[PDB]
């Protein structure tokens, strides 16, 4: 429910200082990539390759912050970088599936409120 609140608070239609699906695709592709990587595997804790590619997703988050200010404000407001941090801390499948679900809810609410 936090995603809907964040999307509503950032409404202006301009969302997240101009963030669009075309700006989101570059990173959300990697997010769903690692999502399929975990979904194929069957293990309670994260696989090491998943951890490494999640770190790569985090640095790609920073790079997308550098690329466009809209993506940067999206990440700082939705804490998605902090979310990949905390799931890396937890290193469990349930939390990281929850984080992918969180990002899905974020993009779904962003699309709905446009």
């Amino acid at each position: 429910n936090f995603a809907r609140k964040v999307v509503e608070e950032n409404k202006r239609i301009v969302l997240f200082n101009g963030l669009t699906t075309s700006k989101l695709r570059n990173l959300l592709e990697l997010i769903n990539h690692v999502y399929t990587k975990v979904y194929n595997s069957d293990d309670t804790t994260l696989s090491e390759d998943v951890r490494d590619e999640l770190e790569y997703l985090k640095v790609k988050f920073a790079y997308e912050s550098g690329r466009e200010p809209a993506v940067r404000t999206f990440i700082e407001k939705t804490y998605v970088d902090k979310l990949v941090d905390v799931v890396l801390k937890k290193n469990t499948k349930k939390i990281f599936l929850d984080y992918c679900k969180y990002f899905e809810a974020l993009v779904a609410y962003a699309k709905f409120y446009r």
Partner: protein
């Protein structure tokens, strides 16, 4: 019951098996049966000037279904509608027990008609909405939001559907309306 049922039921694909007193057994097309049940509730409120309510059980069974089973299930639904304040109709399965005003306005007029007109303006989409709604997961609500974004309908109506799904006891009415619409559009 004996006489005015012919006038009230006029214009429906319905055969009245029996009225005979306080009760009523009715067989017809499912949609015509539901519509005439609502019209009957309104006409009975007009006849008795309030002061009297009747509960109903409405069932949807195929033909060559055991008539004993059909009547027994309809009576079971009627009994399910009896419990409580007795001013209820049990539509199809026992989970869908609604007040007469709730079924007439909240389910059909407010939800079924706008959804049907939206679908006509633009079936499987209703099916995936049902799949997302019947599950209690919050991310199923998120996926419903994404689907309503993708539906290319009037966005005011998609926000209305979001509001209906969010509210408890309004999601059930929305589900019943969608099931009614799906049964309306088949082959």
């Amino acid at each position: 019951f004996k006489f005015e049922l012919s006038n009230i039921l006029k214009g429906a694909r319905i055969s009245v098996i029996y009225s005979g007193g306080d009760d009523l057994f009715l067989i017809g097309a499912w949609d015509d049966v539901i519509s005439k049940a609502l019209v009957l509730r309104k006409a009975f409120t007009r006849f008795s000037a309030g002061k009297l309510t009747f509960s109903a059980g409405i069932g949807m069974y195929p033909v060559k279904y055991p008539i004993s089973k059909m009547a027994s299930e309809t009576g079971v639904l009627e009994d399910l509608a009896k419990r409580g304040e007795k001013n209820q109709v049990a539509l199809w399965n026992d989970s869908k027990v609604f007040g007469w005003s709730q079924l007439e306005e909240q389910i059909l007029k407010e939800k079924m008609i706008p959804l049907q007109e939206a679908l006509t303006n633009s079936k499987s989409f209703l099916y995936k909405m049902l799949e997302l709604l019947r599950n209690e997961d919050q991310i199923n609500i998120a996926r419903l939001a994404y689907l309503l974004a993708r539906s290319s309908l009037s966005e005011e109506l998609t926000q209305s559907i979001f509001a209906w799904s969010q509210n408890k006891q309004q999601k059930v009415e929305l589900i019943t309306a969608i099931e009614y619409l799906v049964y309306q559009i088949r082959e």
